[PDB]
Design an enzyme around this catalytic site. Structure first.
Site, PDB file in Angstrom:
ATOM      1  N   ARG A 100      29.891 -13.386  25.280  1.00 45.64           N
ATOM      2  CA  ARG A 100      31.052 -13.290  24.264  1.00 45.64           C
ATOM      3  C   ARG A 100      32.386 -12.846  25.088  1.00 45.64           C
ATOM      4  O   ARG A 100      33.382 -13.124  24.674  1.00 45.64           O
ATOM      5  CB  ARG A 100      30.736 -12.103  23.035  1.00 45.64           C
ATOM      6  CG  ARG A 100      29.601 -12.519  22.436  1.00 45.64           C
ATOM      7  CD  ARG A 100      29.660 -11.698  20.971  1.00 45.64           C
ATOM      8  NE  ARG A 100      28.344 -11.768  20.395  1.00 45.64           N
ATOM      9  CZ  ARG A 100      28.170 -12.724  19.543  1.00 45.64           C
ATOM     10  NH1 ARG A 100      29.013 -13.740  19.448  1.00 45.64           N
ATOM     11  NH2 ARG A 100      26.746 -13.145  19.199  1.00 45.64           N
ATOM     12  N   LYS A 113      26.426  -2.821  25.205  1.00 44.17           N
ATOM     13  CA  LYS A 113      25.979  -4.286  24.784  1.00 44.17           C
ATOM     14  C   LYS A 113      25.613  -5.097  25.971  1.00 44.17           C
ATOM     15  O   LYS A 113      25.417  -4.331  27.000  1.00 44.17           O
ATOM     16  CB  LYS A 113      26.973  -5.033  24.005  1.00 44.17           C
ATOM     17  CG  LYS A 113      27.552  -4.296  22.657  1.00 44.17           C
ATOM     18  CD  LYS A 113      26.512  -4.313  21.810  1.00 44.17           C
ATOM     19  CE  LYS A 113      26.865  -3.583  20.331  1.00 44.17           C
ATOM     20  NZ  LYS A 113      25.820  -3.711  19.407  1.00 44.17           N
ATOM     21  N   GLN A 128      19.581  -2.981  14.617  1.00 48.48           N
ATOM     22  CA  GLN A 128      18.674  -3.381  15.290  1.00 48.48           C
ATOM     23  C   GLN A 128      17.513  -1.863  15.418  1.00 48.48           C
ATOM     24  O   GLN A 128      16.200  -2.193  15.227  1.00 48.48           O
ATOM     25  CB  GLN A 128      18.810  -3.658  16.818  1.00 48.48           C
ATOM     26  CG  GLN A 128      19.429  -4.764  17.013  1.00 48.48           C
ATOM     27  CD  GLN A 128      19.683  -5.269  18.530  1.00 48.48           C
ATOM     28  OE1 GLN A 128      19.186  -4.689  19.218  1.00 48.48           O
ATOM     29  NE2 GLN A 128      20.438  -6.320  18.677  1.00 48.48           N
ATOM     30  N   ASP A 159      30.515  -7.487  17.026  1.00 51.97           N
ATOM     31  CA  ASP A 159      30.527  -8.157  18.209  1.00 51.97           C
ATOM     32  C   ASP A 159      31.672  -9.090  18.130  1.00 51.97           C
ATOM     33  O   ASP A 159      31.913 -10.014  19.005  1.00 51.97           O
ATOM     34  CB  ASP A 159      29.176  -9.052  17.870  1.00 51.97           C
ATOM     35  CG  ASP A 159      27.986  -8.462  18.063  1.00 51.97           C
ATOM     36  OD1 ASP A 159      27.759  -7.551  18.792  1.00 51.97           O
ATOM     37  OD2 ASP A 159      26.842  -8.847  16.979  1.00 51.97           O
TER      38      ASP A 159
HETATM   39  C1  RC1 Z   1      24.685  -7.391  20.693  1.00 51.91           C
HETATM   40  C2  RC1 Z   1      24.142  -8.651  19.767  1.00 51.91           C
HETATM   41  O1  RC1 Z   1      24.392  -8.686  18.543  1.00 51.91           O
HETATM   42  C3  RC1 Z   1      23.484  -7.876  17.791  1.00 51.91           C
HETATM   43  C4  RC1 Z   1      22.481  -8.265  16.963  1.00 51.91           C
HETATM   44  C5  RC1 Z   1      21.960  -7.546  15.765  1.00 51.91           C
HETATM   45  C6  RC1 Z   1      20.794  -8.053  14.846  1.00 51.91           C
HETATM   46  O2  RC1 Z   1      20.158  -7.090  14.641  1.00 51.91           O
HETATM   47  O3  RC1 Z   1      20.754  -9.337  14.867  1.00 51.91           O
HETATM   48  C7  RC1 Z   1      22.662  -6.208  15.594  1.00 51.91           C
HETATM   49  C8  RC1 Z   1      23.743  -5.650  16.252  1.00 51.91           C
HETATM   50  O4  RC1 Z   1      23.349  -4.877  17.208  1.00 51.91           O
HETATM   51  P1  RC1 Z   1      23.219  -3.225  17.115  1.00 51.91           P
HETATM   52  O5  RC1 Z   1      24.511  -2.714  16.489  1.00 51.91           O
HETATM   53  O6  RC1 Z   1      21.959  -3.058  16.246  1.00 51.91           O
HETATM   54  O7  RC1 Z   1      23.027  -2.471  18.487  1.00 51.91           O
HETATM   55  C9  RC1 Z   1      24.590  -6.706  16.963  1.00 51.91           C
HETATM   56  O8  RC1 Z   1      25.437  -6.153  17.864  1.00 51.91           O
HETATM   57  C10 RC1 Z   1      22.643  -8.685  20.336  1.00 51.91           C
HETATM   58  O9  RC1 Z   1      21.844  -9.411  20.014  1.00 51.91           O
HETATM   59  O10 RC1 Z   1      22.060  -7.547  21.219  1.00 51.91           O
HETATM   60  P2  RC1 Z   1      24.929 -10.254  20.635  1.00 51.91           P
HETATM   61  O11 RC1 Z   1      26.399  -9.907  20.922  1.00 51.91           O
HETATM   62  O12 RC1 Z   1      24.133 -10.369  21.649  1.00 51.91           O
HETATM   63  O13 RC1 Z   1      24.912 -11.195  19.457  1.00 51.91           O
END
Ligand code: RC1
Length: 445
Positions: free
Chosen positions: A400, A348, A170, A321
């Site tokens: 989750r 999270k 992200q 995740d």
């Molecule tokens: C946590 C979660 O899934 C995330 C979604 C995501 C993306 O770019 O699509 C990148 C990760 O987050 P990060 O490592 O950059 O912090 C995941 O853990 C989210 O959407 O916030 P999810 O568990 O809700 O799917």
């Protein structure tokens, strides 16, 4: 309010099902389709709440979104064409939408406000707001850089070269999206690879974005700003994180044989499968192919006897995740499963490390929670596991946690109850129906 649900021991899961679309790719389809020039057509979109919220944010900035038959059609505004939103952008439970949109519109010379639910409002935004401050964005946030946040971009943003400090796709994504409206070259350096949907999709939309990987694995991602983006035809692959639930359930419930169709197999998303295979899982990868620009395959999963393994910290980004559902599988494996490098779990939807550890203990599992690790010792026959008194697992508004413990109840001697199933629809609204069709017994209060 909330709605508890209880999962009961199953006699065998069996069937063939199509898993819902990938959430990460779905979020980006709405975002890039909304930003690009012309029309974007999306098939297979995940219609969970998180994605719908991203769609509403793009509409608020000028994109037109509609669903014709089974295709979502988006009329984009063109790079540099986003319009100032009239009201706050409500991302609900979705950090992906929130963090990526902060980068996307924070660099525009108008105000944008970001809000969300009780869970999203507690999560850290500094990891994205700091690079935006370097790019010239003015930030007004609550203490600790939490929502609500109001951004105001400069007349002319400053491109930066940013080395992401934690393994966050992200953060990498937010900086690249900010680069789209920034003159010059924006560079993101990722020491450890994280999901690459942003890079692959921006290239598909015509962005002059390159990825170079050093022999030591460090990735240097370069993006030339203010370039044209062209609407595309997108075919969304099945969500590998959602797949994890029926997949682990089939491995654990005796007498099971479940096939999941069209699952995304990009290696930045398959750490759980690799780990389960090492534990002894019978997972067959069928007809690996290229679909919609991504690697996909059908997976046939059969009941397996599992053994605990050590999961290295460097595999974490590829399955971050999936630690909750892996911990549940470990509860039924012979011996100890040791997982380190888990600091990211604490920020999270819920602190997933604490929520999983507490849920496992409530359900009779022997585990040790460390500051950044979890050790789980299993009971293969499931005897003594679950909670006979009907005590509910605290989900902390985390879909989750809810889904993982409901899977546990299909296997444990005693049923497993979660305190709330209402957030499951943020990423997998089909969960209850899909699991029921396979034979799972889950009672919604
Ligand atoms: C946590 C979660 O899934 C995330 C979604 C995501 C993306 O770019 O699509 C990148 C990760 O987050 P990060 O490592 O950059 O912090 C995941 O853990 C989210 O959407 O916030 P999810 O568990 O809700 O799917």
């Amino acid at each position: 309010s909330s709605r508890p649900a209880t999962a009961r021991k199953s006699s065998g899961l069996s069937g063939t099902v199509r898993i819902p679309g990938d959430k990460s790719i779905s979020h980006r389809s709405f975002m890039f389709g909304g930003l690009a020039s012309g029309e974007t057509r999306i098939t297979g979109l995940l219609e969970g709440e998180d994605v719908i919220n991203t769609g509403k944010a793009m509409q608020a900035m000028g994109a037109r979104i509609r669903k014709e038959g089974d295709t979502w059609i988006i009329d984009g505004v063109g790079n540099g064409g986003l319009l100032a939103p009239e009201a706050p952008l409500d991302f609900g439970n979705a950090a992906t939408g929130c963090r990526l949109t902060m980068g996307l519109v924070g660099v525009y010379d108008f105000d944008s406000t970001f809000i969300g639910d009780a869970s999203l409002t507690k999560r850290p935004m500094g990891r994205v707001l700091n690079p935006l401050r370097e790019m010239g964005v003015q930030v007004k946030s609550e203490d600790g850089d939490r929502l609500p946040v109001t951004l105001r971009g400069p007349k002319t943003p400053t491109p930066i070269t940013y080395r992401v400090p934690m393994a966050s796709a992200q953060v990498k994504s937010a900086v690249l999206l900010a680069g789209l409206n920034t003159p010059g070259i924006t560079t993101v350096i990722e020491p450890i690879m994280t999901r690459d949907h942003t890079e692959k999709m921006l290239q598909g939309f015509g962005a002059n974005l390159t990825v170079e990987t050093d022999a030591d694995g460090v990735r240097t991602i370069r993006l030339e700003g203010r370039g044209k983006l062209t609407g595309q035809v997108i075919d969304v692959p099945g969500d590998p994180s959602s797949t994890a639930f029926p997949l682990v359930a089939a491995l654990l419930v005796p007498g099971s044989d479940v096939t999941i169709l069209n699952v995304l197999m990009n290696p930045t998303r398959t750490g759980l499968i690799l780990t389960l295979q090492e534990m002894g899982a019978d997972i067959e990868v069928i007809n690996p192919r290229l679909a919609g620009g991504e690697d996909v395959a059908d997976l046939r999963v059969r009941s397996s006897t599992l053994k605990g393994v050590t999961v290295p910290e460097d595999r974490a980004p590829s399955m971050i995740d999936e630690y909750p559902i892996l911990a549940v599988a470990a509860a039924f494996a012979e011996g100890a499963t040791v997982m380190n490098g888990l600091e990211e779990l604490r920020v999270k939807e819920s602190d997933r490390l604490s929520a999983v550890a507490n849920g496992l203990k409530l359900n009779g599992v022997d585990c040790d929670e460390g500051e950044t690790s979890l050790v789980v010792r299993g009971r293969p026959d499931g005897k003594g596991l679950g909670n006979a008194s009907g005590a509910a697992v605290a989900t902390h508004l985390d879909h989750r946690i809810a889904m993982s413990f409901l899977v546990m109840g299909l296997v444990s001697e005693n049923p497993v109850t979660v305190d709330d199933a209402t957030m499951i629809a943020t990423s997998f609204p089909e969960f209850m129906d899909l699991m029921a069709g396979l034979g799972a017994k889950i009672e919604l209060s």
